[PDB]
Design a protein around this nucleic acid. Structure first.
Ligand SMILES: Nc1ncnc2c1ncn2[C@@H]1O[C@H](COP(=O)(O)OP(=O)(O)OP(=O)(O)O)[C@@H](O)[C@H]1O
Ligand SMILES: Nc1ncnc2c1ncn2[C@@H]1O[C@H](COP(=O)(O)OP(=O)(O)OP(=O)(O)O)[C@@H](O)[C@H]1O
Ligand SMILES: [Mn+2]
Ligand SMILES: [Mn+2]
Ligand SMILES: [Mn+2]
Ligand SMILES: [Mn+2]
Ligand SMILES: [Zn+2]
Ligand SMILES: [Zn+2]
Lengths: 340, 356
DNA sequence: ATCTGTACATGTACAGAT
DNA sequence: ATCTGTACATGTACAGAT
DNA sequence: ATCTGTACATGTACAGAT
DNA sequence: ATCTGTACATGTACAGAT
């Protein structure tokens, strides 16, 4: 009852989706065309849409869109950075940039910013660079505000790096044939010290969000609806509302929630453990899983098992205890935060 | 248990598989390479292994392989032959290495098959390290069949096929009803794969005889056989074993044994049995209706179903709903009744034909 | 010199063998 | 249970062609 | 190489039926 | 309340034309 009503509030409106999408598509098409057909270092960059809007787990409003501009590279040589699992040096047009990530991002960002100056028909600016973040972020102002993250990424077509050998443990859930095929796809590197890139599996996570049942018919027109995505949306909402209220939660992001629920989906593969009539206890067992991650300070990258997203190197113990207390409070009081 | 022991007799032996597959691949690789030579009209033909051996339902011995030599054919327009749903005339838009077989835009199937056969016969002649010959042509067969004496006898059907990448012919819009079983995403992807036309090659005396092609979906059936569960992990190393393929084997065997004994059953073929079970798998989508512990009553329900198809004279092509493989036009009532009595007899007497 | 159809190289599900 | 041969999907090398 | 056309997936929206 | 059926909307894969 309660959680149904929250999900109705979170649902995007069809009209709001139509307006944001056609503005976003205008800017993205024009930027993609400024690459390639202008003999840049990024000729041949191809588009791939990623993230919550395209996985259909976006909540509240269509106000944030993620796009990769992926660029195939002749067979590069990778070297793992100091055993971090997820970060790598890259070695061997592009000779203008060891393939320095910051050097290549800056030219990328220099092109985007120039093309945005010549957009006289949409209110669109380029957000001040956030260091380390791999994105070039656009603030579009429809009558409403929309973020777009243009993520530069190298596409490599060989075996996945060995730090992922034990990753993606879908064998008992989506199965071995799905896993083998997923791992036959390319992998991607995005910018993160100034020469380091980071692995990306946004394409693999997109497939999983839209192929998320042990049953091939899960959530199709001739199958049964499950509540996996609704739990992702609810857990996403709880963290969004808590990040607004508390600056102490600045080090948490939605990817932390995404990763935890990939683990829950793997720990509980059956589609009937995610029946829509059991939406409450499903969401509760996700809260308890997420609190177990905080207490043990352990949340492994789903594709890179040794990379702990909750290591003290990245998040202070106090931040996790703070979030642990705030989540425990919303849990034991009917989620008052969902009504504001 | 009794059915468990039949499957062990039906189980292929890896030693036999190894020697059969070594010879068969040597011959096919050499025929395929010959097709790419000179001004051969079949340049660019590609190989696609189909049928029971590659679905892992081949029984008793590895002694019959099917392989498709498919040739992609671009601007192609199709005329359904007399509302049959499965048979087509193939016409060409622009007036081409295949022009040698045209007859005013209409592409002759038996002209193409003859040139295919002649080339195959010639390459078989120059194979000196293997005892292989080319079977006398069989009417209604799209295939050029090789007999190998590897000491043991081995049949190989080289099937000539046209490959069209366009959307499937509308006679199939209602076919492949896998929405409640393998689902709609699977169905949409499957129907984005090409479709194939093989020569009908009948000598019936009917009009358009040598210019009639038949639709083929061996490629879609290979996928289904090897991805047969509602659950993605069905029969995988971290999932539950089902008995779907084991039922198909037991039924294939019932028909093979009876066909071996009774000339009356010449009109029947293993595809009837494959088709019947695709309907049974659609009817019973859940993996739990194909539990290994209920192999007996699973095999029994597929029998009851096959009997109803023989008696009511209705077994729809899985992909072309309006094509009835058991119409009276194709098989006599007398032939269907005879098989119905024989299946009944085995069913209610402990299957004594398994012990032969 | 580069290009490219052909064939080797790699990895793993499937199921037979032990 | 683990070891293992065949089939097949996709990446990559390179002899011969340009 | 680039771009449109097509089909049907994933959604939202709502009335009528349960 | 939910379930079913139809309208409406965008996203995505790829054939075929240029
Ligand atoms: N720390 C990270 N490590 C790896 N991939 C990440 C990380 N952060 C983001 N991504 C990838 O980028 C995508 C876009 O991330 P973003 O921050 O927009 O969140 P999201 O999943 O799209 O959801 P939302 O925007 O609604 O919070 C993610 O879905 C994920 O694939
Ligand atoms: N009458 C038919 N109509 C349509 N497709 C057919 C027909 N006969 C055969 N096929 C196709 O050709 C394939 C090869 O036929 P074949 O007679 O070898 O049987 P099979 O399914 O391979 O089994 P087995 O040879 O072990 O009896 C079949 O799997 C099917 O895809
Ligand atoms: Mn997003
Ligand atoms: Mn983002
Ligand atoms: Mn066969
Ligand atoms: Mn055959
Ligand atoms: Zn679902
Ligand atoms: Zn199975």
């Amino acid at each position: 009852d309660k959680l149904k009503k929250v999900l109705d509030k979170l649902r995007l409106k069809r009209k709001d989706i139509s307006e944001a999408a056609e503005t976003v598509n205008k800017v993205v098409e024009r930027l993609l065309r400024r690459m390639q057909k202008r003999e840049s270092e990024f000729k041949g960059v191809e588009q791939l849409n990623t993230g919550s809007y395209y996985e259909h787990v976006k909540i509240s409003a269509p106000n944030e869109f993620d796009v990769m501009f992926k660029l195939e590279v002749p067979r590069i040589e990778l070297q793992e950075y100091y055993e971090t699992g997820a970060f790598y040096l890259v070695k061997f047009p592009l000779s203008h940039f060891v393939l320095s990530a910051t050097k290549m991002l800056s030219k990328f960002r220099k092109i985007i910013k120039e093309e945005v100056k010549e957009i006289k028909d949409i209110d669109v600016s380029v957000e001040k660079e956030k260091p380390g973040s791999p994105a070039v972020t656009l603030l579009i102002r429809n009558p409403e505000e929309i973020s777009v993250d243009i993520i530069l990424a190298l596409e490599s077509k060989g075996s996945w790096p060995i730090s992922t050998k034990e990753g993606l443990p879908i064998q008992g859930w989506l199965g071995t044939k799905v896993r083998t095929n997923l791992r036959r796809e390319p992998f991607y590197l995005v910018p993160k010290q100034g020469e380091t890139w980071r692995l990306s599996f946004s394409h693999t996570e997109k497939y999983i969000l839209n192929n998320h049942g042990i049953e091939k018919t899960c959530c199709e027109s001739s199958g049964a609806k499950c509540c996996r995505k609704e739990c992702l949306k609810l857990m996403k909402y709880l963290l969004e509302q808590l990040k607004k209220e508390f600056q102490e939660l600045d080090a948490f992001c939605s990817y932390h929630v995404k990763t935890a629920i990939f683990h829950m989906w793997t720990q509980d593969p059956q589609d009937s453990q995610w029946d829509p009539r059991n939406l409450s206890s499903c969401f509760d067992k996700l809260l308890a899983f997420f609190l177990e991650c905080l207490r043990t300070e352990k949340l492994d990258h789903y594709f890179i098992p040794k990379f702990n997203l909750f290591s003290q190197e990245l998040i202070d113990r106090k931040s996790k205890e703070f979030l642990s207390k705030k989540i425990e409070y919303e849990r034991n009081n009917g989620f008052p935060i969902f009504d504001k």
